[PDB]
């Protein structure tokens, strides 16, 4: 029994189903593969097309999943899609009314067209199963918990008819207990409010990181006008008729002004964040307090995109409402895609479930075999120096103890948004200055942002307060208190409120990463590391060896540990040997607007990425000419001869575009099919 | 007391307040000027920036209105804006949360900035008055009716808080009797349905033209699921949580297929339009039957954008409910901008009202003085031949009797969407072939709609069943039956159900145009003309002389009558003497997309108009190089020297871009400041 789970929209690599398809129209595309009830492979399409939270059809992810399972398309017994057919088709039909040139292709036709054109796979109609959206979430969250009965709560922005659903799970059967309508959405509430802070879709966890810097009393009575807690686990959100945003009109009337890009986060902004976070904590705990005592369950599985609110989860853990809580590493819609595989399997026969609680999210493609990795690192030789230590883990522990910030890339990539020891950036957790600098210089992000620690399972209760319910900490699902007597020791990873979104690593969840942290603790006395995701501000978590090396070279990391090779940047790297390539969404434009006296204005030149919310940057006339000659095979140095050789100012301009990922720059060739 | 009324959004000429600001965010921008209670000038900004139903700040409209009144900006005593300040600022604030780079500028500061920078006018805060949206509508509709009191109904998409409002008006006082909430919007219902027909905002009038071709029984029971009529003039529209469109989910579930671009209308499409039109009629007559009985009033004024549904108006007229009905020529948001001026006057002092019922919509800028008009037509000489007949009207009527299709441009442009004898295209109303013929001449694809007839007041009741109430017909507000015995005679202007959107012209409403239609009737025996707006498919109604000549030269009209001059195009017009100028929204682009094997891919050259819904067209590498050299003064022929001369192929390419109005092409210089004609 081999079953594919699918989620996302249906756009091709280089175009969208309608032009500029909004970024929230079926986002976080992914593919998962289950075999005999076990999750054998899963990867988000963002890792492969390099578009964060992409809506494009997860073609590459399907291909990578099949290869990891050693399967052909013809081996797949069924395909589950994470929404009902009538809902996604009605939304497609709506887009087609707004875009009268788009042909009327609905989801079944588009899914089959993508699989046939992109994988040579003719999917028969009877093998495609559409699934209620919150049922898909619930299966994914519950079946990986290792529990044999539980309360299951799903809270997201919306499914087809509901923003929240409550289930009883027993054995492999789900029984719906209750639901909450779409206008009561807590995901929608959090996203509406996120927009007041100059942020957008995907930035909610940044708002969450901002909340502890604020005082929730300032705007508590304002948010109190937007919701009412009612008897027996009910609540209401109070909408308005002015604009499609629950939050902005009231806050505007009280004189709150939305933050602008590039402007500081004021104390009013921080206080706004703190009151928002308190509001959805109050509502969710109200829901759970009622359904815990009503359902009788002592164990909770929590899923849906709202379950990535690590602060909320930590509060649930400390609430005393449950004995055990489980949260999946991919509780957003990528996890619903996996749940749609289990639901499709259930619709066609008995359902097989995982045998054990999931401990590792290392489920994506790996980096390659040892031979091809070493060969590809040799292609990068004009840029990097490579060393092959006898014991890379021992060597990396020492570099960390000496204050180096390390890129760390091993085996299969993490499913879901957290880095957990396979595509990580790691540093000494003790100095508070590491937080200041890794925010400012490495990740190039806001100074208020916290950093998450990883601790060995054996030392976890020496540093963190895990009391209350038994939660699963393998995936940084829970914010927990750092013990007061350890807060000054753990300066880089203790948040302003004394908490940490902790990863507890064990020999079973991540043997190699556990050894790294254990050895570091033997050398320093502190078995705790800072662990942030391996990506710059312009990209999702790195996937391939080329992604890893590109990110290392365009961030300010000290050294890269990749499959036991230590990589350092050459003193003077030769950018000239790199072969530029367009991404499928890369565009180059020479533009004139109107000028004075209704003339044609002066020409300007720009590169941009062609998707909703994609970046753009001005380029010089010289680089515009250079980039127009890109062929995918010719090196940057040779291309540059048509404009008088790779200038130092030209190399610098190209390097800035590379850092922003407007194009692909990498040595000729590629690593080949992954061994 | 000189009061300016404003409506629309706040964008400058060349950018929008947020990029690609949606075409529905405070559209049909306009400026109106009232003086001691009289409307002295009004024009929609679309006529001046040439963007249909534009949302941009009506700066040109304000400048033109002040010039017509002989006023400085500093002479204005108050400015009224057609929405409450908190509502428009909350919408702007919402736009600013979606675009975090936009500076936080709200409506008061933006109004003051545009007026300061555009006119040197420092508007004091106390002179700016913000007005309830449906109140602005009601004042404009009622104060121009000539009525001593009336029931006043406003239906549109939405105001700040309602989609419909009912008032009793008396003297200059308005008293609100009822309202209907935003989600019950009939303007919203109609526009939602319009999208299923492959159309968009501003195409509702086309859907209404299509409805008579359809059988309303096909989808009657489907639409019945979307509304319920209730007691006491109430009704409900049944929404859905699937998508922000009331109509598409249920029709999708029943197998309906939204029409695609360039696809012809199926019978299903025709029937859909017919059931939609029936639906809105049933609901509006349900509202009006209750409020006529409850108010006891025998007179109705009807405004808001829904009041441009002239088939509905015609059915209101034929209902037994009222003795008089009045509809303003600009019942859409441009007229709310007017009504905001009245409300501001009532607020900050006493409200003076118009002396008489409005008979003419000739209220925008004129074409110019007789001498600058002849001076300017001389600049066009390499393209046209001009005659100066003794009596242009007499000549025009003869040409019309011979079968010619004329452009007709006189005086001040019409306020509101209908051409009424000042920016019109006129032809014999009798030949049914003229429908297909004239649609081809202006390159429009609305052969399924008949054109609208204009008739003299004296003959009106010889041709049209005006019975029922007394409606005002000076603005084509009512669809009325064409008398059976006259239907085959009026072949170009009679619809498949026997109806027509009639303009009745009188010596009082438009002296010149009345004389023209009268004279034509003396020569032919039929004192009825076809009258359609003077614009091709790519522009609003022409405004200036240059607009008029440009439109004449880019359509296949036989002859142009403009201010007593007879204009015809030369055989072989010399396009090279035209000076190209970018419009503020013109963009010229060379583009590379991604190619196979991750190469830099297909290279293309394009021109487009940078606004939501703006057109675009491919251009050749040679024309790209020529257009990039446009300086606003050098002629097309001289610019073309830099790429080898103006070849027949290049001139053909440019002409097609001219037809689509991607740039301005006209002789060097301009007509100069419009002459103070002494009126
Ligand atoms: N079907 C569907 O809606 O997709 P989905 O399961 O992937 O969840 C997305 C929703 O989670 C909300 N969300 C994401 N992170 C969140 C956070 N830290 N706190 C609250 N809500 C959050 C987000 O704002 C958005 O409303
Ligand atoms: N504030 C505000 O909403 O603007 P507004 O007063 O200018 O009216 C616009 C509304 O009239 C509706 N509308 C326009 N023409 C229409 C027609 N022939 N039939 C029905 N509705 C129409 C149109 O679909 C739109 O919903
Ligand atoms: Fe979801
Ligand atoms: Fe309106």
Author numbering:
A (entry chain A): 1 to 675
B (entry chain B): 1 to 679
Paper text:
Carbamoyltransferases (CTases) catalyze carbamoylation, an important modification for the bioactivity of many secondary metabolites with pharmaceutical applications. GdmN and Asm21 contribute to O-carbamoylation at the C7 (S configuration) of geldanamycin and ansamitocins, respectively. CTases in class III, which modify secondary metabolites, adopt two nucleophilic half-reactions, the formation of carbamoyl-AMP derived from ATP, CP, and Mg2+ and the subsequent transfer of the carbamoyl group from carbamoyl-AMP to the secondary metabolites. GdmN forms a face-to-face homodimer through unusual C-terminal domains, a previously unknown functional form for CTases.
Therefore, the co-crystal structures of GdmN/AMP/1 (2.80 Å resolution), GdmN/ATP (2.00 Å resolution), and GdmN/carbamoyl-AMP (1.98 Å resolution) were determined. The electron density clearly revealed that 1, CP, carbamoyl-AMP, and the nucleotides were bound in different substrate-binding sites. In the GdmN/AMP/1, GdmN/ATP, and GdmN/carbamoyl-AMP complexes, the electron density of AMP, ATP, or carbamoyl-AMP only appears in the subdomain of the Kae1-like domain, and these compounds make similar contacts with surrounding residues to those with TobZ. Further experiments indicated that GdmN shares a similar adenylation mechanism with TobZ. Carbamoyl-AMP appears to surround the iron ion binding site, with the amine of the carbamoyl group coordinated to iron ion and the carbonyl oxygen accommodated by the conventional oxyanion hole composed of the backbone amides of R158 and G15732. Subsequently, the docking studies using the GdmN/carbamoyl-AMP complex and 3 suggested that GdmN would be unable to bind 3 in the expected orientation, as we assumed that 3 might have steric interference with loop 2 (D156-H162).
